[PDB]
Amino acid sequence: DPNQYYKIRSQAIHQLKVNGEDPYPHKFHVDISLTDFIQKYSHLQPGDHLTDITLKVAGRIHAKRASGGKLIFYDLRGEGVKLQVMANSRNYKSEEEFIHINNKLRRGDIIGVQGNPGKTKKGELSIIPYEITLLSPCLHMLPHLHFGLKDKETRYRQRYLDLILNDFVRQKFIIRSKIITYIRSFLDELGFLEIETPMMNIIPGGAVAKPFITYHNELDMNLYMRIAPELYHKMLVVGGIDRVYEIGRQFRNEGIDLTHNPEFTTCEFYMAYADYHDLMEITEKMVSGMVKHITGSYKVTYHPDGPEGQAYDVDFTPPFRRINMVEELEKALGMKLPETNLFETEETRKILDDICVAKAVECPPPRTTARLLDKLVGEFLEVTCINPTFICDHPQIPLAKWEGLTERFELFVMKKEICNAYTELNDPMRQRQLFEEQAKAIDENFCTALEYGLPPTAGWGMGIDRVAMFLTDSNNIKEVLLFPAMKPE
Amino acid sequence: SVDPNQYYKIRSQAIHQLKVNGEDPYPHKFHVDISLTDFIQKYSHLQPGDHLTDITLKVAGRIHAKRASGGKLIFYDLRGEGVKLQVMANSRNYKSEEEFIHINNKLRRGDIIGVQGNPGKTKKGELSIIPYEITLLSPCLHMLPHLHFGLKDKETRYRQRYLDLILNDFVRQKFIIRSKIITYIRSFLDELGFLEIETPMMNIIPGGAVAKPFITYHNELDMNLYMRIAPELYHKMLVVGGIDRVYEIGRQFRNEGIDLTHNPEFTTCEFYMAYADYHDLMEITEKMVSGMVKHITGSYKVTYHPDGPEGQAYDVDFTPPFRRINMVEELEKALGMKLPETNLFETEETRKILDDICVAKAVECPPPRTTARLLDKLVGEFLEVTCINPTFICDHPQIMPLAKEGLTERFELFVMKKEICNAYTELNDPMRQRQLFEEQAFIDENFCTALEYGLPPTAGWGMGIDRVAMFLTDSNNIKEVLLFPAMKPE
Ligand SMILES: CC(=O)NCCCC[C@H](N)C(=O)O
Ligand SMILES: CC(=O)NCCCC[C@H](N)C(=O)O
């Protein structure tokens, strides 16, 4: 069993220490990465052996296949590449020390290799070791070679084991970092200032979201983990920093599952003297440019239900489809809806309720205008948004800006919102009124800031984790979080 | 005269009157054709008296000064993006004389406005825009300080950062530099093949030690969580997983006192590199720091005022190579004497030798006068305060960790007598680490298990972004480099 293997191996390692062969006190200086070792010496023809060149490589042993006792082959792994170590007893420092190192090494051990490049008769590039050094043994039993960790729960609870055994996982978080790095580069080149704003607030945000509450001792007061940096960003726009963005963590005290995590990453930027239409060009350039630069093409494949399930083609080629919500809902329903400034009335609500019935689009027991419109929008518009599609001018039925239609777009990809933009409010009187009525159902410092004068501004937000899922062909959030929150063992 | 509250009430009335009259400024939208900065670059070559009636442009900004020059002419000092441009509102050139007076009498100091007009330069030689139409966009409802005065009261600057940014341009340039420091680090490490990662800020076990943590309660899991102080354990688990070069520039949290050099949240950078030791990271730190200073500021030489502008100015020279000193030997050379052999630093006999030394050289040490604390004060007064230029101080004795001949393998880089970053050779013996976590006043068994799968020889590196931003913005408290610093209750 795995526990016995662990007890046996830990004993053998303890014995190596008392014998003065402690593997850990060693430090190993690599002369060439495995990736570069391949590049330089992949041109050698079968049977080559560069006796003159001695180099030091390191990596993790994934396979050990003997060939009589005079020859052992190791599958040395690292950086996502493979390199064969052909341990030939003749070529080792001595026969006695060749036997001794092979006796102690097991699958999974970290080792450094000093030897000469070369290609075997079968033609696979190798390094012929003059000396192999154990640097850090693997004390636990790993799965059988071509087996691995299929159990997602284990993969998520032991990410280091997941990366040791599954190369596709490493490529995911490389993709994740390239997304964040691309956003910074795109926005920096537009003159945006990357900023950091408080993650702990003296009062909870004016938003529907159960918060993380923590207590500050010296202040004798509770602090609240942030849900978003918006109000800090607009205070800086008032201060004269016209273009600000922040790619940082947000916190929500809610339920954990395959699509929700208590901490997650968002990007927000605010741009003075812009409206939601100006941000549509920017969103199209960034998102499309991001996809092509990272993946090599404008067309991506996504598996909403797993590799075995259906596969959707997603075409990020510009221009992205644009739609005005009400007009397209009318065109999709084949009927004219009430004029947009009569959407608060109870007569319009009835009409929507009837429409949902007549087309078998059932609504939550709360059959309101907001909910009947939500499920109509979802069933007739959002579901058709396979390619990147801007959905704009949503009915108010409360922030944003104003003939009954909100100044805004949401960008949908694979039937889901990945980012959205708003034209911002700057009337300090109106912003105040919202706060005080919201507080009966307030940020005094932010109201004051608007009293000094916020210019016309446009806001923009994106959920990074969702974007990482769609571009890594992942269908749960635990695949794109290095150490996802997990329910108790 | 008018006090600030009365000004606010009058202005609020006036702006409400504008809405009553169908002249609401806020719903107005204004697209800018060119930024004030590019405006100056593109038309500063013009000569005095010029007026380009052939070009109409839309600029915008905040009114800082309004100077009437007769009944038909008004001058506005318009500022934005850290630059300034004069608006010469000549009633003759305005759309109409009646609209000209109407708008100018609404406008006050601090109002945000959009200007549509022609470039030009007056007879005195000030580049200006000649408005055809000025638009009120967002009025400043509060009274600002007089033009050449401002906000010197530090507390008001920190509590109302927007007003500090409106009135003080040196404040904008500080946070521009701050952002360039972080961006430069990302660029430097990204070139060396590092993977920028994100690790949990919320832990289920209190991390580290001697760091009172922020505690928060997760409702669904019915459990307490702890805000992180360092990402280190998560990083090394990723090195175990084969990601050999990782870094994270993120926020750390300490439940501590709030003062001019302590903030409950702060930014650190850490990276871990497999198959490297602290020596390998010395050349990396040197290149990164020297190149950073020169790139951002234009030279290796920086001037720092640790006591304020009207204080001693220090010349800090980042020219490579940085001075390197081994702690014990240079301490021996500075004190002019031989110290006990390094293996004997845990003996009462060594503690008395150091006590006798501290007394003989008037190195005050507050009880308890242990060896670790006696050595720290001797080092501070004979080495650390000598390090004006960037200086590596290395091989500190162990009596002064879970780090790695009685001398731990690390270097601290000191600038202006204080540590800006440090590096350690990491420990990878799992059997050791499991016992070393058994220091108390908990144990991360998940991290102990990960090491049991095998961590290669690794080296860690850590830097406080805030202190570095302080030294490069000529700031001497931490609130100057934090956009919204924590402030005691008002
Ligand atoms: C008016 C408004 O909704 N402001 C919020 C910030 C701007 C929108 C952006 N998409 C966001 O909230 O992230
Ligand atoms: C051995 C040790 O103290 N490790 C801690 C993490 C590595 C050092 C790094 N410079 C840091 O603590 O930030």
mmCIF file with all atom_site columns, N, CA, C and O and ligand atoms in Angstrom, chain B residues 230-233 236 268-272 281 401-404 409 421-427 459-463, ligand 2:
data_model
loop_
_atom_site.group_PDB
_atom_site.id
_atom_site.type_symbol
_atom_site.label_atom_id
_atom_site.label_alt_id
_atom_site.label_comp_id
_atom_site.label_asym_id
_atom_site.label_entity_id
_atom_site.label_seq_id
_atom_site.pdbx_PDB_ins_code
_atom_site.Cartn_x
_atom_site.Cartn_y
_atom_site.Cartn_z
_atom_site.occupancy
_atom_site.B_iso_or_equiv
_atom_site.pdbx_formal_charge
_atom_site.auth_seq_id
_atom_site.auth_comp_id
_atom_site.auth_asym_id
_atom_site.auth_atom_id
_atom_site.pdbx_PDB_model_num
ATOM   1   N N  . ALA B 1 230 ? 2.486  35.812 3.507  1.00 0.00 ? 230 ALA B N  1
ATOM   2   C CA . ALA B 1 230 ? 3.475  35.539 2.471  1.00 0.00 ? 230 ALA B CA 1
ATOM   3   C C  . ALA B 1 230 ? 2.980  34.382 1.616  1.00 0.00 ? 230 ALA B C  1
ATOM   4   O O  . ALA B 1 230 ? 2.309  33.482 2.133  1.00 0.00 ? 230 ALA B O  1
ATOM   5   N N  . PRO B 1 231 ? 3.290  34.374 0.320  1.00 0.00 ? 231 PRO B N  1
ATOM   6   C CA . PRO B 1 231 ? 2.874  33.272 -0.562 1.00 0.00 ? 231 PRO B CA 1
ATOM   7   C C  . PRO B 1 231 ? 3.854  32.110 -0.646 1.00 0.00 ? 231 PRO B C  1
ATOM   8   O O  . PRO B 1 231 ? 3.649  31.223 -1.480 1.00 0.00 ? 231 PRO B O  1
ATOM   9   N N  . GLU B 1 232 ? 4.853  32.065 0.238  1.00 0.00 ? 232 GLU B N  1
ATOM   10  C CA . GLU B 1 232 ? 6.038  31.238 0.019  1.00 0.00 ? 232 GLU B CA 1
ATOM   11  C C  . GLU B 1 232 ? 5.698  29.760 -0.093 1.00 0.00 ? 232 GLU B C  1
ATOM   12  O O  . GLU B 1 232 ? 6.188  29.068 -0.994 1.00 0.00 ? 232 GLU B O  1
ATOM   13  N N  . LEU B 1 233 ? 4.901  29.240 0.841  1.00 0.00 ? 233 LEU B N  1
ATOM   14  C CA . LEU B 1 233 ? 4.616  27.811 0.838  1.00 0.00 ? 233 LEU B CA 1
ATOM   15  C C  . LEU B 1 233 ? 3.917  27.392 -0.444 1.00 0.00 ? 233 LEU B C  1
ATOM   16  O O  . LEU B 1 233 ? 4.193  26.313 -0.982 1.00 0.00 ? 233 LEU B O  1
ATOM   17  N N  . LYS B 1 236 ? 6.631  27.171 -3.315 1.00 0.00 ? 236 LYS B N  1
ATOM   18  C CA . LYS B 1 236 ? 7.486  25.992 -3.295 1.00 0.00 ? 236 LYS B CA 1
ATOM   19  C C  . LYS B 1 236 ? 6.714  24.733 -3.664 1.00 0.00 ? 236 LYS B C  1
ATOM   20  O O  . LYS B 1 236 ? 7.281  23.820 -4.273 1.00 0.00 ? 236 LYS B O  1
ATOM   21  N N  . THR B 1 268 ? 4.303  43.036 -1.557 1.00 0.00 ? 268 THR B N  1
ATOM   22  C CA . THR B 1 268 ? 5.611  42.406 -1.595 1.00 0.00 ? 268 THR B CA 1
ATOM   23  C C  . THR B 1 268 ? 5.756  41.679 -2.919 1.00 0.00 ? 268 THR B C  1
ATOM   24  O O  . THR B 1 268 ? 4.764  41.281 -3.536 1.00 0.00 ? 268 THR B O  1
ATOM   25  N N  . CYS B 1 269 ? 7.000  41.499 -3.352 1.00 0.00 ? 269 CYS B N  1
ATOM   26  C CA . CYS B 1 269 ? 7.315  40.608 -4.461 1.00 0.00 ? 269 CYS B CA 1
ATOM   27  C C  . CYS B 1 269 ? 8.176  39.462 -3.949 1.00 0.00 ? 269 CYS B C  1
ATOM   28  O O  . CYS B 1 269 ? 9.141  39.691 -3.208 1.00 0.00 ? 269 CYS B O  1
ATOM   29  N N  . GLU B 1 270 ? 7.821  38.237 -4.340 1.00 0.00 ? 270 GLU B N  1
ATOM   30  C CA . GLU B 1 270 ? 8.600  37.041 -4.041 1.00 0.00 ? 270 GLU B CA 1
ATOM   31  C C  . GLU B 1 270 ? 8.731  36.205 -5.308 1.00 0.00 ? 270 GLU B C  1
ATOM   32  O O  . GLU B 1 270 ? 7.794  36.130 -6.107 1.00 0.00 ? 270 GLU B O  1
ATOM   33  N N  . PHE B 1 271 ? 9.902  35.589 -5.500 1.00 0.00 ? 271 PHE B N  1
ATOM   34  C CA . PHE B 1 271 ? 10.115 34.624 -6.573 1.00 0.00 ? 271 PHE B CA 1
ATOM   35  C C  . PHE B 1 271 ? 10.993 33.503 -6.032 1.00 0.00 ? 271 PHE B C  1
ATOM   36  O O  . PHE B 1 271 ? 11.794 33.705 -5.115 1.00 0.00 ? 271 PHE B O  1
ATOM   37  N N  . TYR B 1 272 ? 10.805 32.304 -6.583 1.00 0.00 ? 272 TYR B N  1
ATOM   38  C CA . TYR B 1 272 ? 11.569 31.121 -6.216 1.00 0.00 ? 272 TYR B CA 1
ATOM   39  C C  . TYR B 1 272 ? 12.106 30.496 -7.488 1.00 0.00 ? 272 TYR B C  1
ATOM   40  O O  . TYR B 1 272 ? 11.400 30.410 -8.494 1.00 0.00 ? 272 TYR B O  1
ATOM   41  N N  . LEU B 1 281 ? 21.280 34.334 -6.861 1.00 0.00 ? 281 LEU B N  1
ATOM   42  C CA . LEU B 1 281 ? 20.327 35.429 -6.847 1.00 0.00 ? 281 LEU B CA 1
ATOM   43  C C  . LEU B 1 281 ? 20.975 36.778 -6.554 1.00 0.00 ? 281 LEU B C  1
ATOM   44  O O  . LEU B 1 281 ? 20.302 37.803 -6.678 1.00 0.00 ? 281 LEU B O  1
ATOM   45  N N  . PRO B 1 401 ? 16.742 30.152 11.952 1.00 0.00 ? 401 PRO B N  1
ATOM   46  C CA . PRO B 1 401 ? 15.502 30.178 11.171 1.00 0.00 ? 401 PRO B CA 1
ATOM   47  C C  . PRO B 1 401 ? 15.218 28.842 10.490 1.00 0.00 ? 401 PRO B C  1
ATOM   48  O O  . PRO B 1 401 ? 16.069 27.950 10.531 1.00 0.00 ? 401 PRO B O  1
ATOM   49  N N  . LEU B 1 402 ? 14.043 28.709 9.870  1.00 0.00 ? 402 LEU B N  1
ATOM   50  C CA . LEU B 1 402 ? 13.773 27.579 8.983  1.00 0.00 ? 402 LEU B CA 1
ATOM   51  C C  . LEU B 1 402 ? 14.397 27.798 7.615  1.00 0.00 ? 402 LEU B C  1
ATOM   52  O O  . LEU B 1 402 ? 13.796 27.468 6.592  1.00 0.00 ? 402 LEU B O  1
ATOM   53  N N  . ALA B 1 403 ? 15.611 28.352 7.580  1.00 0.00 ? 403 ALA B N  1
ATOM   54  C CA . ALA B 1 403 ? 16.252 28.766 6.337  1.00 0.00 ? 403 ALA B CA 1
ATOM   55  C C  . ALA B 1 403 ? 17.117 27.653 5.755  1.00 0.00 ? 403 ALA B C  1
ATOM   56  O O  . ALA B 1 403 ? 16.630 26.813 4.992  1.00 0.00 ? 403 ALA B O  1
ATOM   57  N N  . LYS B 1 404 ? 18.396 27.633 6.119  1.00 0.00 ? 404 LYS B N  1
ATOM   58  C CA . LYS B 1 404 ? 19.345 26.642 5.612  1.00 0.00 ? 404 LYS B CA 1
ATOM   59  C C  . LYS B 1 404 ? 20.761 27.012 6.038  1.00 0.00 ? 404 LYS B C  1
ATOM   60  O O  . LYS B 1 404 ? 21.095 28.191 6.167  1.00 0.00 ? 404 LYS B O  1
ATOM   61  N N  . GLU B 1 409 ? 22.725 30.701 4.931  1.00 0.00 ? 409 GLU B N  1
ATOM   62  C CA . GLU B 1 409 ? 23.010 31.136 3.564  1.00 0.00 ? 409 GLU B CA 1
ATOM   63  C C  . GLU B 1 409 ? 21.943 32.137 3.137  1.00 0.00 ? 409 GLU B C  1
ATOM   64  O O  . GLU B 1 409 ? 20.880 31.770 2.628  1.00 0.00 ? 409 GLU B O  1
ATOM   65  N N  . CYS B 1 421 ? 15.407 44.178 0.235  1.00 0.00 ? 421 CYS B N  1
ATOM   66  C CA . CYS B 1 421 ? 15.084 42.840 -0.248 1.00 0.00 ? 421 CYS B CA 1
ATOM   67  C C  . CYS B 1 421 ? 16.075 41.834 0.323  1.00 0.00 ? 421 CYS B C  1
ATOM   68  O O  . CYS B 1 421 ? 17.199 42.180 0.699  1.00 0.00 ? 421 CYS B O  1
ATOM   69  N N  . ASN B 1 422 ? 15.644 40.575 0.361  1.00 0.00 ? 422 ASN B N  1
ATOM   70  C CA . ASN B 1 422 ? 16.445 39.508 0.931  1.00 0.00 ? 422 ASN B CA 1
ATOM   71  C C  . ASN B 1 422 ? 16.218 38.224 0.147  1.00 0.00 ? 422 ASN B C  1
ATOM   72  O O  . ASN B 1 422 ? 15.212 38.058 -0.551 1.00 0.00 ? 422 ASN B O  1
ATOM   73  N N  . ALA B 1 423 ? 17.187 37.322 0.263  1.00 0.00 ? 423 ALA B N  1
ATOM   74  C CA . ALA B 1 423 ? 17.182 36.055 -0.447 1.00 0.00 ? 423 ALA B CA 1
ATOM   75  C C  . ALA B 1 423 ? 17.772 34.988 0.461  1.00 0.00 ? 423 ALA B C  1
ATOM   76  O O  . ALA B 1 423 ? 18.701 35.261 1.234  1.00 0.00 ? 423 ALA B O  1
ATOM   77  N N  . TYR B 1 424 ? 17.212 33.781 0.370  1.00 0.00 ? 424 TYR B N  1
ATOM   78  C CA . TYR B 1 424 ? 17.642 32.624 1.139  1.00 0.00 ? 424 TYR B CA 1
ATOM   79  C C  . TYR B 1 424 ? 17.846 31.438 0.204  1.00 0.00 ? 424 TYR B C  1
ATOM   80  O O  . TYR B 1 424 ? 17.161 31.310 -0.817 1.00 0.00 ? 424 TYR B O  1
ATOM   81  N N  . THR B 1 425 ? 18.776 30.558 0.572  1.00 0.00 ? 425 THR B N  1
ATOM   82  C CA . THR B 1 425 ? 18.770 29.198 0.052  1.00 0.00 ? 425 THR B CA 1
ATOM   83  C C  . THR B 1 425 ? 17.673 28.421 0.773  1.00 0.00 ? 425 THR B C  1
ATOM   84  O O  . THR B 1 425 ? 17.629 28.403 2.007  1.00 0.00 ? 425 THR B O  1
ATOM   85  N N  . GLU B 1 426 ? 16.777 27.802 0.009  1.00 0.00 ? 426 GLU B N  1
ATOM   86  C CA . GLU B 1 426 ? 15.620 27.156 0.611  1.00 0.00 ? 426 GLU B CA 1
ATOM   87  C C  . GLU B 1 426 ? 15.969 25.775 1.155  1.00 0.00 ? 426 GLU B C  1
ATOM   88  O O  . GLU B 1 426 ? 16.877 25.099 0.662  1.00 0.00 ? 426 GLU B O  1
ATOM   89  N N  . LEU B 1 427 ? 15.227 25.361 2.178  1.00 0.00 ? 427 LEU B N  1
ATOM   90  C CA . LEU B 1 427 ? 15.347 24.022 2.737  1.00 0.00 ? 427 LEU B CA 1
ATOM   91  C C  . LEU B 1 427 ? 14.402 23.081 2.007  1.00 0.00 ? 427 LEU B C  1
ATOM   92  O O  . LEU B 1 427 ? 13.235 23.418 1.774  1.00 0.00 ? 427 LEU B O  1
ATOM   93  N N  . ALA B 1 459 ? 16.018 28.474 -4.280 1.00 0.00 ? 459 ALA B N  1
ATOM   94  C CA . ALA B 1 459 ? 16.406 29.736 -3.659 1.00 0.00 ? 459 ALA B CA 1
ATOM   95  C C  . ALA B 1 459 ? 15.231 30.706 -3.705 1.00 0.00 ? 459 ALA B C  1
ATOM   96  O O  . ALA B 1 459 ? 14.613 30.890 -4.757 1.00 0.00 ? 459 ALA B O  1
ATOM   97  N N  . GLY B 1 460 ? 14.934 31.333 -2.562 1.00 0.00 ? 460 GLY B N  1
ATOM   98  C CA . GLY B 1 460 ? 13.863 32.294 -2.464 1.00 0.00 ? 460 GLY B CA 1
ATOM   99  C C  . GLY B 1 460 ? 14.362 33.721 -2.394 1.00 0.00 ? 460 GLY B C  1
ATOM   100 O O  . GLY B 1 460 ? 15.515 33.982 -2.036 1.00 0.00 ? 460 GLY B O  1
ATOM   101 N N  . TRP B 1 461 ? 13.477 34.655 -2.730 1.00 0.00 ? 461 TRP B N  1
ATOM   102 C CA . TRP B 1 461 ? 13.820 36.066 -2.845 1.00 0.00 ? 461 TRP B CA 1
ATOM   103 C C  . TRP B 1 461 ? 12.584 36.899 -2.552 1.00 0.00 ? 461 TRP B C  1
ATOM   104 O O  . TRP B 1 461 ? 11.512 36.625 -3.098 1.00 0.00 ? 461 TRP B O  1
ATOM   105 N N  . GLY B 1 462 ? 12.740 37.905 -1.694 1.00 0.00 ? 462 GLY B N  1
ATOM   106 C CA . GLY B 1 462 ? 11.616 38.716 -1.267 1.00 0.00 ? 462 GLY B CA 1
ATOM   107 C C  . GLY B 1 462 ? 11.941 40.189 -1.142 1.00 0.00 ? 462 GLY B C  1
ATOM   108 O O  . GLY B 1 462 ? 13.023 40.559 -0.671 1.00 0.00 ? 462 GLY B O  1
ATOM   109 N N  . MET B 1 463 ? 11.005 41.039 -1.554 1.00 0.00 ? 463 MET B N  1
ATOM   110 C CA . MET B 1 463 ? 11.198 42.482 -1.542 1.00 0.00 ? 463 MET B CA 1
ATOM   111 C C  . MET B 1 463 ? 9.908  43.178 -1.146 1.00 0.00 ? 463 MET B C  1
ATOM   112 O O  . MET B 1 463 ? 8.825  42.821 -1.622 1.00 0.00 ? 463 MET B O  1
HETATM 113 C C1 . LIG C 2 .   ? 14.520 29.912 3.847  1.00 0.00 ? 2   LIG C C1 1
HETATM 114 C C2 . LIG C 2 .   ? 13.440 30.957 3.964  1.00 0.00 ? 2   LIG C C2 1
HETATM 115 O O1 . LIG C 2 .   ? 13.448 31.782 4.904  1.00 0.00 ? 2   LIG C O1 1
HETATM 116 N N1 . LIG C 2 .   ? 12.452 30.961 2.978  1.00 0.00 ? 2   LIG C N1 1
HETATM 117 C C3 . LIG C 2 .   ? 11.385 31.911 2.955  1.00 0.00 ? 2   LIG C C3 1
HETATM 118 C C4 . LIG C 2 .   ? 10.936 32.169 1.523  1.00 0.00 ? 2   LIG C C4 1
HETATM 119 C C5 . LIG C 2 .   ? 12.183 32.312 0.695  1.00 0.00 ? 2   LIG C C5 1
HETATM 120 C C6 . LIG C 2 .   ? 12.929 33.567 1.053  1.00 0.00 ? 2   LIG C C6 1
HETATM 121 C C7 . LIG C 2 .   ? 12.260 34.794 0.423  1.00 0.00 ? 2   LIG C C7 1
HETATM 122 N N2 . LIG C 2 .   ? 13.182 35.862 0.118  1.00 0.00 ? 2   LIG C N2 1
HETATM 123 C C8 . LIG C 2 .   ? 11.191 35.293 1.377  1.00 0.00 ? 2   LIG C C8 1
HETATM 124 O O2 . LIG C 2 .   ? 10.944 34.894 2.514  1.00 0.00 ? 2   LIG C O2 1
HETATM 125 O O3 . LIG C 2 .   ? 10.445 36.322 0.883  1.00 0.00 ? 2   LIG C O3 1
#
